[PDB]
Symmetry: D2
Subunit: 281 residues, 4 copies
């Protein structure tokens, strides 16, 4: 069981109290990001949950060219700077090109490898070389025993602060399932890397003929309870005050007024299961 | 809908979980009495409602000479002695329509095998026998499609139906449990109790605690479990029962007192 | 060899010209059955394709107890007897309960194990013991290398005349895919049983009409037979079926492809 | 629609199939020339239109320790020698936006890798470079969503897009080919040419492996099925001794079997391209 140091007082580990990697899908404006982060900060401080603010500066992989992509790298890094200065919390964002790794690492405290891109050697190596902890989204196409090779790429250039994020596996066409057995397989084939659960993207599904993802936000509690009960290092979550109006993955986003309600149940379950042993062997 | 199984045993999705626990196949009277005894002691100590499980026949094994159990006549005699001795209700699976009535005289719950869940005459003969029914969800069936089998049971007068998750086909020779399916099963069938068969879900590519925790945390009516004192010689090793069940009860008591977020 | 003889002039084999196991979903009336069988016979004769007429006497797995189930066993065997007498064609039907196997075997030339029921020991043994060739529908949930256990069960009670029928594999919820690599797996792991492709029930898939694409792909692999259901107006049918007027069009493409691949060699790729 | 690739090579779903055939990865000039030479001899003899394929880089090997190929600069020089020596058009894959333009100066078709087909700036870069594009369908993408990749290419002025089947995720560590996908790809994209990558479609793997498995012994089963549907092309990799290939050896056709495979493909293709749809 390895523990990954993110910032003062924030360390992720499979035996430790869970860390919330929480925020929004996509950066739209400064004031909206500050307001939503402000709400996450209030709730996580109230409940004593360690917190890392999440947002994407770009959606580089939208299905349609007409779908919204975000403010982009230059404006996104400025919004993150203001989040950090305003709230004093660390931030997490994803990186889509090798040349983005260094500039992003000047501001972000964790760099994320997107799910479709986790096998791309030069991107992973560039992210790892940037010197921050790395969150690897497990591809929809990848068995949980194969993530070890992604971790070895990071380790090869000297970065041993790697976390592994579950976000669902392809189940026929246009649907995901979460294999709850995958968490242990990920941890035990990688020397105990912290395992995180993206309950938001795991809820994705879609219409065969659709222009954008569908999703299953009404069931977020079902999935979040089940995952946190396994015993894991972190929970990855997106929210929006009105999910029907979100610009990306609205169908899977938690309504922001339900945040305290969800997190109080996560803490209660995490506090309970983190004290329970393995069965006697 | 809560389903009354016997005095002091009612399964329901908002109620404390019921353990449907026992062994894979009936082999002898004395060994069945001994294992059921261990299940009774642990569940009584922990305070978990209990229904004893065993099959009288394995009707779907890979060779005609492979061991099938004591069979119907002998199995029912064993079940009669389990009930008389421990005062416990019992659940067993029915493989042929004509077994329904005889099984129903002794068993308190009749189970529909997963492969057979769509066979009209078997389901109807089971439903008509007048005891609560447990329907194993086929590996091949989506969780919004169980409603038809429940309606078949209702069409011959049986509204005491429970639904059991045992995994979904995931490529060749492998099963995954979609934890989103529990709510689907309950909501599309008017709120039938949902049960999670942790043992047969693990017919897949050590792992039982992880999966049992995950399922119980969703908030469900029951857990379905097989054990053996020495599984080698997917059954739980019998000495781990108390350790497993105390984790199950603590998680279950917690989630059953926390509310739904009605997320729109 | 591992070729299965069904009746005079009709043998199924992975290296032989393909056999059509062709007919209808369910027996509803004598005259409708004779009319459709009549058409299959006329087309298959014209094209020179060996033919076995298919029908179920009961649909045992409909979604309501009040849903129409067909004429039933007694009336069904009566209908098959008149089909055999009128056309001199062998017949295949599926058997759902152990006790049906013997009386069905008096009349039918091939007995079929339903897909959902292929692991049920007493049903399969009763079917195998009745002494006719057996067609095993591969269950949606079963891998192509596991069918061998069903075939062994049949051999353990004296039946070495077993054929294996692809009908799709589970692919997420409410959808089937046909894995074209599984035909060879089925054949090779069972000592060379004839493999058959059920194009009709394989098309119980999503369609966000495609029978031709799929039949061409399957027959091109090089297999023992095609399983097909048809109806004059499928939408007004009782319980996926090909429009009957397209039968000759479909089968002429199937014959031309089959004749071609059956005279080109397997490559031994190490 | 028909996609003109070079003089005497046009791909289309009603046309005689085009072979996009070659090797998995460029290792050296002489081996590339020798293998390309055998493909050119065999296709010319049989009368099959031909585009030579190879990767200059494998940018997505599972292991950091696995072989990647000669790389962009040396790869482009090999391709220039292959073109001058045989007069064959070539196809290669592109992994970063900035590679598209230099690649297009030499390659005659540019390929989008399966895992990267949703990456907007990559697809747009590739499209803008002015050559026909081959899009590998992701293992995670349904056949009716390829239309969105085609629209990205269209949005920047490139309507010469072909769509390549290479299998779909089937549980863990396995692929299946849905033969009903070809039509769905063609009919939702205004009739783009559909290609079938028989080689990568055969991939499977060991859960604890370091590299891909594969099922080359079944390449004929699969290739027959797919060509019989009625498609625009076949995508194929070979090696003289597949066990020693440095990438995807488990799925590679033994090179001495090339003429035998291809003669069957031509026979089935010529037959099916003469047969109509069923009467409505
Ligand atoms: O454009 P659609 O189909 O909604 O796809 C959404 C994705 O871009 C989004 O989930 C993204 O992968 C977050 O990383
Ligand atoms: O490195 P392994 O796991 O063999 O994976 C091989 C892939 O890189 C290869 O298929 C590539 O996608 C195109 O050849």
């Amino acid at each position: 069981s390895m523990n990954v140091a993110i910032s003062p007082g924030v360390t992720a580990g499979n035996s430790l109290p869970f860390v919330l990697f929480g925020g929004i899908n996509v950066l739209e404006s400064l004031d909206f990001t500050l307001d939503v982060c402000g709400e996450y900060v209030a709730v996580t401080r109230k409940l004593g949950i360690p917190f890392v603010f999440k947002a994407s500066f770009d959606k580089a992989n939208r299905s349609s060219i007409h779908s919204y992509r975000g403010v982009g790298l230059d404006e996104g890094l400025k919004i993150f700077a203001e989040v950090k200065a305003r709230f004093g919390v660390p931030v997490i964002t994803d990186v889509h090109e090798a040349e983005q790794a260094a500039p992003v690492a000047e501001i972000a405290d964790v760099l994320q490898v997107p799910a479709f891109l986790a096998r791309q050697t030069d991107l992973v190596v560039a992210i790892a070389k940037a010197g921050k902890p790395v969150n690897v989204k497990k591809p929809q196409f990848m068995s949980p025993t194969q993530l070890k090779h992604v971790v070895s790429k990071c380790g090869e250039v000297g970065n041993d602060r790697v976390m592994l994020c579950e976000r669902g596996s392809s189940f026929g066409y246009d649907n995901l399932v979460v294999d709850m057995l995958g968490f242990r397989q990920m941890a035990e084939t990688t020397g105990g890397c912290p395992v995180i659960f993206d309950v938001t993207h795991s809820l994705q599904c879609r219409d065969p003929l659709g222009d954008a993802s569908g999703g299953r936000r009404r069931q977020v509690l079902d999935l979040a309870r089940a995952g946190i009960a396994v015993g894991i290092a972190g929970l990855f979550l997106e929210a929006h005050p009105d999910p029907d109006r979100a610009r990306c993955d609205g169908p899977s986003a938690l309504p922001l007024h339900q945040l305290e309600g969800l997190l109080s149940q996560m803490k209660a379950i995490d506090d309970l299961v983190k004290r329970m042993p393995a069965l006697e062997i």
